[PDB]
Amino acid sequence: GASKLRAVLEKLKLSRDDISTAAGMVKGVVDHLLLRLKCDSAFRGVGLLNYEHVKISAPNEFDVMFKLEVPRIQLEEYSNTRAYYFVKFKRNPLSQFLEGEILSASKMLSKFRKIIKEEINDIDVIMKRKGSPAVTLLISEKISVDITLALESKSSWPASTQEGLRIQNWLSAKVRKQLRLKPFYLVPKHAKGFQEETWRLSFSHIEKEILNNHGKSKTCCENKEEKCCRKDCLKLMKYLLEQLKERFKDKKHLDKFSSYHVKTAFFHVCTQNPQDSQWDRKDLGLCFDNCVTYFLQCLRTEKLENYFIPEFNLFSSNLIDKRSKEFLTKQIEYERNNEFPVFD
Ligand SMILES: Cc1nn(-c2nc3c(F)cc(F)cc3s2)c(O)c1C(c1ccccc1C(=O)O)c1c(C)nn(-c2nc3c(F)cc(F)cc3s2)c1O
Ligand SMILES: [Zn+2]
């Protein structure tokens, strides 16, 4: 059924051609928002990080990160979670959001939301409150934009990342060092009621960079000889999960699975298969099959290390229970045995 996979990819490309216009609407609203926000003393250095689509099958649902540099940050890991932190300061335009020594995600979300509500009120845009994403904008008839606030730190990545991003045999030890000199991000995100002043690490910019500059060869996919199917494999994996989540929206079994699980699984497969010749475009069928198989193996063993924080198990039974993983395992295996009927 490799041809059927290409059929899917054809459809997905069409949907992207016919959304350029929507992305224009989004850029205009977002540019407006950023100008107003930059006049607030708290948000003076607000900017775009890189739009993106968390759901490949939802072309009108956009996703945008507003970054804000926080100099001289000091992090305090929450409860050995490796991914969630309290934000302190070494020595402040954010001082108004302090709860004691801690930058309050609650308060900084409050103001972020207030200001956005103001500007939307002045513009045919409508808003709705969602911590990350913080708000959802309705633009025109059927365009949504989730906006995440993200603190930026130009300091060294936290200790939990020391053994992560194991790209050395694939993208190289040089690239790994360059990427770890880039900043990292913190999004407001409560941890399990719930600890309500934690911030979670975010490496979405690094994920973006790897996906778009993904070969061992620097010229991978820039000529006929070197076309690979890495990006097509990830698209197919995302579309598979999205179709299944839609199909079983009435069950609780697939609610905790997201595109981040699929994308994490994929990067692990890139690590296991570092040579570009292992991703020949002519081998799309077996390449996707081997991505599907890897994700399934993560499901059955309940092991999916965060690609950047290897001690963080995305498939822990504290996060997703065994029954849910077994259901998804059964459904994917059915799809794969039947040439993926869910695609149509
Ligand atoms: C990737 C993703 N996909 N997805 C869906 N996919 C589907 C789908 F496929 C079908 C469907 F119907 C519905 C959805 S929604 C989603 O919501 C996300 C969220 C996200 C998207 C947009 C705004 C905010 C969030 C957010 O919550 O932060 C997301 C992001 C971008 N990063 N991230 C993590 N990064 C780290 C990390 F760096 C370290 C660590 F230890 C843990 C984590 S977790 C995470 O969880
Ligand atoms: Zn390539």
From Swiss-Prot:
Relate the outcome reported for changing residue 129 to E: Reduced nucleotidyltransferase activity
Cofactor(s), names only, from the UniProt record: Mg(2+); Mn(2+); Zn(2+)
Question: Which segments carry the region annotation Interaction with collided ribosomes?
Answer: 168-206
Regulation of its activity: The enzyme activity is strongly increased by double-stranded DNA (dsDNA), but not by single-stranded DNA or RNA. DNA-binding induces the formation of liquid-like droplets in which CGAS is activated. Liquid-like droplets also create a selective environment that restricts entry of negative regulators, such as TREX1 or BANF1/BAF, allowing sensing of DNA. A number of mechanisms exist to restrict its activity toward self-DNA.
Amino acids binding ATP:
61-63, 204-207, 238, 259-263
- Outcome after substituting residue 177 to E: Impaired association with collided ribosomes in response to translation stress. Decreased interaction with nucleosomes
Phenotype for residue 238 to Q = Acetylation-mimetic mutant; reduced enzyme activity
Leftover remarks: The cGAS-STING signaling pathway drives sterile inflammation leading to type I interferon immunopathology in severe COVID-19 disease caused by SARS-CoV-2 virus infection. Tissue damages in the lung and skin lesions are caused by activation of the cGAS-STING signaling leading to aberrant inflammation. Endothelial cell damage is also caused by activation of the cGAS-STING pathway: SARS-CoV-2 infection triggers mitochondrial DNA release into the cytosol.
Residues carrying the site annotation Important for preferential detection of curved long DNA = 27, 35
Consequence when changing residue 90 to E:
Abolishes stimulation of interferon production. Abolished interaction with nucleosomes
The PTM entry states: The N-terminal disordered part (1-160) is phosphorylated by AURKB during the G2-M transition, blocking CGAS liquid phase separation and preventing activation. Phosphorylation at Tyr-51 by BLK promotes cytosolic retention. Localizes into the nucleus following dephosphorylation at Tyr-51. Phosphorylation at Ser-259 activates the nucleotidyltransferase activity. Dephosphorylation at Ser-259 by PPP6C impairs its ability to bind GTP, thereby inactivating it. Ubiquitinated at Lys-238 via 'Lys-48'-linked polyubiquitin chains, leading to its SQSTM1-mediated autophagic degradation. Interaction with TRIM14 promotes recruitment of USP14, leading to deubiquitinate Lys-238 and stabilize CGAS. Ubiquitinated at Lys-13 and Lys-208 by RNF185 via 'Lys-27'-linked polyubiquitination, promoting CGAS cyclic GMP-AMP synthase activity. Monoubiquitination at Lys-174 by TRIM56 promotes oligomerization and subsequent activation. Monoubiquitination by TRIM41 promotes CGAS activation.
What does changing residue 256 to T do? Answer: Found in patients with uterine endometrioid carcinoma; reduced nucleotidyltransferase activity
Residues annotated as carrying (Microbial infection) Deamidated asparagine in the record are 50, 213
| N6-methyllysine modified-residue sites | 330
Q: Give the residues the record marks as binding 2',3'-cGAMP.
A: 63, 146, 189, 200
Its recorded name reads Cyclic GMP-AMP synthase
Annotated site, Cleavage, chain positions: 146-147
